[PDB]
Structure 1
Amino acid sequence: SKISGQNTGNYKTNIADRIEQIFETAPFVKIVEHHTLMTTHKMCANWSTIPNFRFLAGTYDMFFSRIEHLYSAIRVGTVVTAYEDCSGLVSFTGFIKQINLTAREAILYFFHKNFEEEIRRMFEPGQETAVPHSYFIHFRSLGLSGKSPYSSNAVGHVFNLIHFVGCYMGQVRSLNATVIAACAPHEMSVLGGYLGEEFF
Structure 2
Amino acid sequence: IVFKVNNQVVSLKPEIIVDQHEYKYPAIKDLKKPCITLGKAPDLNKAYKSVLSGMSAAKLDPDDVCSYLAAAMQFFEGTCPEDWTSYGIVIARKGDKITPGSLVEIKRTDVEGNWALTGGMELTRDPTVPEHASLVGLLLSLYRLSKISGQNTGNYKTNIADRIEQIFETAPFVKIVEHHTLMTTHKMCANWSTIPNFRFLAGTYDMFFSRIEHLYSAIRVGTVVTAYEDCSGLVSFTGFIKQINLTAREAILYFFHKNFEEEIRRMFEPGQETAVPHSYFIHFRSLGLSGKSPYSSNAVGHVFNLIHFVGCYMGQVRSLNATVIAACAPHEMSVLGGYLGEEFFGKGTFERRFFRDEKELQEYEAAETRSPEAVYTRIMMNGGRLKRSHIRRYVSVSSNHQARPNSFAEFLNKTYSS
Cα distance in 2 for partners of 1:136, 1:121 equals 15
Q: Unaligned stretches of 5+ in structure 1?
A: none
Q: What is the match of residue 259 of structure 2?
A: 114
How far apart are residue 9 of structure 1 and its match?
Answer: 2.7
CA distance in 2 between partners of 1:190 and 1:11 (Å): 35
Residue of structure 2 equivalent to 1:195: 340
Structure 1-normalised TM-score?
A: 0.98
- CA distance in structure 1 between the partners assigned to 2:147 and 2:164 by the alignment: 15
Shift of 1:77: 0.1
Residue 175 of structure 2: which of 21, 25, 30 is its match? Answer: 30
What displacement does 1:4 show?
1.4
Q: Which runs of 4+ in 1 moved over 6 A?
A: none
Q: Structure 1, residues 115-149: CA drift from partner, whole Å, max 9, x if none?
A: 11001100111211000100000010110110000
Aligned residue in 2 for 1:102: 247
CA drift of 1:87 comes to: 0.4
Measure the CA separation in 2 of the matches of 1:71 and 1:176. 34
Query: 1:57 corresponds to which residue?
Result: 202
- Per-residue CA deviation, residues 146-182 of structure 1 (Å, 9 max, x unaligned), is 0000000100000000000001011111111111111
Give me the whole-angstrom Cα distance separating, in 2, the residues matched to 1:22 and 1:69: 15
Per-residue deviation, 1:10: 1.4
**In structure 2, distance between residues paired with 1:35 and 1:154:** 38
Structure with bigger RCO (C-alpha 8 Å, 6+ apart):
1
Cα separation, 2, equivalents of 1:81 and 1:125? 24
Q: Which residue of 2 aligns with 1:42?
A: 187
Spell out, residue by residue over 1:2-46, the C-alpha distance to the aligned partner (whole angstroms, 9 max, x if none): 111222131110000010000111111111111100110011110
Q: How far, CA to CA, are the matches of 1:177 and 1:30 in structure 2? A: 37
Identical counterparts, % of pairs: 100
CA deviation map 1:83-107 (0-9, x unaligned) = 1111000100111111111111111
SS at match of 1:10: coil
Greater helix fraction, Structure 1 or Structure 2: 1
Aligned length: 198
Q: 2:284 aligns with which of 118, 122, 139?
A: 139
Distance 2:239 2:171 in 1: 35
TM-score (norm 2): 0.47
Residue 128 in 1 paired to residue 309 in 2?
no
CA distance in 2, matches of 1:97, 1:22: 32
Q: Give me the whole-angstrom Cα distance separating, in 2, the residues matched to 1:123 and 1:7.
A: 36
CA displacement at 1:192 relative to structure 2: 0.4
Higher Cα Rg: structure 1 or 2? 2
Question: How far does residue 112 in structure 1 lie from its aligned partner after superposition?
Answer: 0.6
Task: Output the CA distance in 2 between the equivalents of 1:128 and 1:2.
Answer: 26
